[PDB]
C-alpha cells in the first residue's frame, strides 16, 4: 500500500515571499484531496535551483496549516550545516508536527555553494558520514562533548525516519545498511542515452534491498516528475520551455540527449506531461513504481501557474492515485 | 509610545511537546489581549534553563497561529549557531511572518554548552563578533566566499531589526555605535558590596550609554524584560512564587553573588521579580525608572514556576491593569 506524495523545490514565479505561500497553498490543497506526504528541497544562493533554504523553518510554518500530511525534507544538504543544530531543529520541529516529519539527506550540490561552508565538494562525501552520525548519536541521546550535554528536547524516534538521496548502487548499499530510506531522483544521467529510468534505477533498488537489516521494512521513495492538466495539448504547451531549458543544462553538464523535439525530452528527461489518460499510459512503463513504497510527483522540468498546479495536484489524486496506491 | 512584550524560555511543567503547545497558546492568548510583541529564549541540552533551542523554528509555527503580535528572539546564542544558516533562516522566517521578526542575539550562556559547538565559554565575545558581522553581510547582499554566492531570499530589511542582549556600559557602546538596539536583562549582579542597589541604577548607566553612542537619525530601542507574575488574589500569587523564588536565590548563590537574607520580600527585591495582585505589581513598577525610558517593556514569569492557566490569567491582568500605566 503506497504512499502518495506531493514534492516542491519552491521555484514558482515571484518573490520569495510569494514563492512561500504559493507552496504552502499546494502542500494544503495535497493534503485536501488525500496526498499522503509532501516533500521539500533545500537549495541556497540560487533563486532559479530552488526558493528554499530552510526547510525546517519552512515545515514548522506549513505544519501548523495543515493536520494529516507527513512532511519530509527531499533533502538537507547535510554537508552544507552545522549538523547538532540540525539535529535540534527536526527534534523540535518533529514535536510541532505532532509526529509528521521525515528527514531525508542528501551531499550533492552546485561545487560553488560548499566554500561558504567551510569545505569543498570533493569532500562532501565524507562530510556528510561525520555529520550524519553525529545525528544519529545525538537523536540517541548520547552525550554531547561533556557529560552535562544531551540534546533536548530528545527525538529517540527520528532515527527511524531517515532517508538518503543516492544516484548509485555504493550510496544504496550505505543506506540500506543502516536501515534508511532510499530515495530516487526524479531524473539520472544515462551510461545509451536513451535507457529508460528504471533500467537505471531498479539495479538500485537491488542493491538497497539486499543490504536491509532483516527486520526492517524497506522504504524506497520514487519521485517522479509530472504535469497534468485536462487538456493533453495545454499540458505540452506549458511543458515546452521548461523542458527545452532542462535539456541545454543538461547538455551544459556533459550529457548528451538525442533529439531537438518535444516528445524526444519527455522520454529523456523523464518528464511525464500530459492529460490524465496520457500520463496514466506512461507512469505504467516505469517498472520502478511498483516497487516503491512512496511515491511523489513534482511539476520541475515544468514552470506552470499556480493555479495549473493546483489542478495538477487534483487531477493526479483523482485520476492518476488508483493506479499507484 | 511603548511596546508591551511577553517573553518566554519555554520552561512549564511537562514535556516538550506540552512545552510548546503551552507556549503556542500563551503567545496567541498575549495577543489576543491586546500585547505588541511576543520574545522566546533559546537554550540548549537543559530542560532545565529552558525547553527551546531551535527559536526560528518555534516560530514559523506560531506565525502562522498569530496575525498582529511581533515575534522575537530575547536571545540567538549567536556563537553556537553557524551563522550563514541563522542568516538565512532568519531571512525566510520576517517572510513567513509578513515583516513581524526581531532578532535579538546574545554571547553569553552555560559554558559547558559552548563544547558542542567547537568553542569554549571565553572565546564567546570573539566569535560574537565575527558572527554578527558574517550575518550583517550576508543580509545585505554582499557575496558569500566567492561571486556566484548571494543570499537568497534576501532580508535587506533585517539589519535595522537587530538587539544585541548585554549587561555592560561596554557592550551598550557597541550596540548603540552600531544602530542596534538594547535588550536589558531581568536581573543582574550587584556591585560588590552593594548587594540592595536597585535594578534601575544599574541599568539606567547602562542606557546612558547607549543612547550617548547611536548615530544621529537612529532612533533608539531598549527593551527592558522584567520578571513579573499576577494574580487575582495577592496571597496567592506570592504563594506560587516563593519555591521558584527560593531556587532561584540559590542558584545566584552558588555563582558567587550575594544575595542578604532568606525573606520571600529580600528574594522579590533582590531578584527583583514583581509578583502580586495588580495593585502590588503596579506599585512596585512604578519604582524602576528604566520602565519610563525603554520602548519596549517585557514581562515573564521565571523565578516563578505558575500553572499554565495562571500563565493565561497574568498574561490578562498585565494587559488590562499593568499596561495602562506604562504604554
Excluded: C
Excluded at 554537508?79 to 539527506?105: I, Q, S, W, Y
Excluded at 530510506?181 to 538497497?208: K, V
Amino acid at each position: 500500500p503506497k504512499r502518495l506524495g506531493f514534492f516542491t523545490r519552491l521555484l514558482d514565479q515571484g518573490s520569495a515571499q510569494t514563492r512561500y505561500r504559493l507552496a504552502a497553498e499546494q502542500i494544503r490543497h495535497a493534503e485536501r484531496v488525500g496526498f499522503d506526504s509532501a516533500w521539500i528541497a533545500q537549495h541556497h544562493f540560487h533563486e532559479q535551483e530552488g526558493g528554499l533554504p530552510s526547510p525546517l523553518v519552512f515545515l514548522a510554518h506549513v505544519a501548523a496549516q495543515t493536520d494529516r500530511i507527513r512532511l519530509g525534507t527531499a533533502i538537507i544538504t547535510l554537508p552544507m550545516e552545522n549538523p547538532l543544530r540540525v539535529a535540534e531543529d527536526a527534534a523540535v520541529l518533529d514535536l510541532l508536527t505532532d509526529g509528521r516529519l521525515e528527514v531525508g539527506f542528501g551531499s550533492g550540490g552546485t561545487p560553488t555553494s560548499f566554500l561558504p561552508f567551510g569545505l569543498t565538494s570533493e569532500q562532501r562525501g565524507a562530510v556528510f558520514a561525520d555529520h550524519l552520525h553525529l545525528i544519529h548519536s545525538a537523536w540517541r541521546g548520547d552525550t554531547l562533548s561533556h557529560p552535562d550535554n544531551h540534546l533536548y528536547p530528545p527525538a529517540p524516534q527520528l532515527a527511524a525516519r531517515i532517508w538518503i538521496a543516492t544516484f548509485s548502487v555504493e550510496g544504496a548499499i550505505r543506506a540500506g545498511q543502516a536501515g534508511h530510506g532510499l530515495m530516487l531522483s526524479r531524473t539520472q544521467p544515462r551510461p545509451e542515452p536513451r535507457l529508460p529510468l528504471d533500467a537505471i534505477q531498479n539495479p538500485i533498488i537491488d542493491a538497497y534491498l539486499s543490504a536491509l537489516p532483516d527486520g526492517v521494512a524497506p522504504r524506497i521513495l520514487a519521485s517522479r516528475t509530472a504535469f497534468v492538466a485536462d487538456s493533453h495539448a495545454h499540458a505540452l504547451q506549458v511543458a515546452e520551455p521548461g523542458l527545452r531549458k532542462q535539456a541545454a543544462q543538461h547538455r551544459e553538464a556533459g550529457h548528451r540527449i538525442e533529439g531537438d523535439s518535444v516528445t524526444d525530452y519527455l522520454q529523456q528527461l523523464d518528464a511525464h506531461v500530459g492529460d490524465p489518460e496520457h500520463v496514466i499510459a506512461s507512469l505504467a512503463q516505469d517498472s520502478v513504481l511498483a516497487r516503491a513504497t512512496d511515491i511523489s510527483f513534482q511539476v520541475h522540468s515544468v514552470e506552470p501557474s499556480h493555479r495549473d498546479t493546483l489542478r495538477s495536484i487534483e487531477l493526479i489524486a483523482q485520476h492518476i492515485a488508483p493506479h499507484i496506491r
